[PDB]
Amino acid sequence: AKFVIRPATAADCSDILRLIKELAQVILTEKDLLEDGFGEHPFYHCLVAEVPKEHWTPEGHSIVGFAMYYFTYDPWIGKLLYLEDFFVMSDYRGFGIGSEILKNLSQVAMRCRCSSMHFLVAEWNEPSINFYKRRGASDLSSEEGWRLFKIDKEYLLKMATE
Amino acid sequence: FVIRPATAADCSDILRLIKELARYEYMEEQVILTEKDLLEDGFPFYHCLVAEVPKEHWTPEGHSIVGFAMYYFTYDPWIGKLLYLEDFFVMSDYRGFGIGSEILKNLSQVAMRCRCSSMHFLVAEWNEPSINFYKRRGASDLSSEEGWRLFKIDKEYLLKMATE
């Protein structure tokens, strides 16, 4: 199908949520997406793929893919573009949407002068691993010995009132 | 001591601590942050906290900053805004006063106000002192629990995709 890649706008929040859930507990609401993505200080940025009516989803939707990203920083690497999620609806793959999205993400990285694009991949997802390796990716966690940790809300609360 | 947001006047000390920490992680040679960059991106692509001591506590050569944390906000499509701790370090001579503990408490307060549901960060495989420090506070290993591996595609490869 004919498609165009463009930045998401506040009007696209319901579609972004639809796509997140399709990519998928998702407890994020449309209201969160609007408040967090379109205020003076946005916490994420999104590129979406839009198709014309002859190709709308059965449900009658025009957005069929997205890439959610944001900028991060590492004192010993550089400014970085962090790719949080990337998803194209099954029936809309094979027409170049993903390749155009990755192309535009890369151009954005060049504009921001980012030294690298970072993202996570599950250790057992060989297909995804090889898709990214074919594009020059390296498993930083394994090569340099880095593990990802988290501290959840119940713990943060205890320390914040302590 | 006191934990407080950093200011341009702190840029010098922050760079110094960044390099101390870098050496501890085996990569001081990779540091490309400059006091000028920290000024142009810190006041922003990141936020810094610094532990400042009074003068009777100033370091032997006169530094008043003995520790810092660098953080920024990220996003998870399932739960929303997250707080990401990029770097955390306390000078050796000042590691018994409970400064690291206070920095984490400050960061937790930042998370609570900004409605972050989780704080993420990386830890070196062999960094037992850091792993235990975080685990005693409730941290869990996500690479273990969910299989995540951090991948990177450097500039030279982004250029190839951008110009294809």
Contact A28 B77 (CB under 8 A): yes
* CA dist., res. B91 & res. B33, Å (int): 19
User: Which tokens sit at A105?
Assistant: 């993400």
Quote the Cα angle for B150-B145-A132, to 5°. 25
* B81: β partners: B75
State which amino acid sits at residue B123: V
Catalytic residue among B46, B71, B134, B157: B134
Burial class (CB in 10 A: 0-12, 13-18, 19+), A109: buried
User: Which tokens sit at B48?
Assistant: 């810094």
* A127 in a labelled binding site: yes
Cα B81 vs. chain centroid, distance in angstroms? 18
* CA dist., res. A126 & res. A143, Å (int): 17
All structural domains of chain B, each given as residue ranges with its CATH number in brackets, are 1-164 (3.40.630.30)
B26 min Cα distance to partner chain A (Å)? 10
* B35 in a labelled binding site: no
**Which of B25, B104, B147 has its CB closest to that of A122?**
B147
* CA dist., res. B155 & res. B164, Å (int): 14
Q: Give the catalytic positions of A in this structure.
A: 132
* CA dist., res. B116 & res. A119, Å (int): 20
What's the length of chain B?
A: 164
Tell whether the torsion through CA atoms of A55, A135, B159 and A77 is positive or negative: positive
Return the SS3 of A87: strand
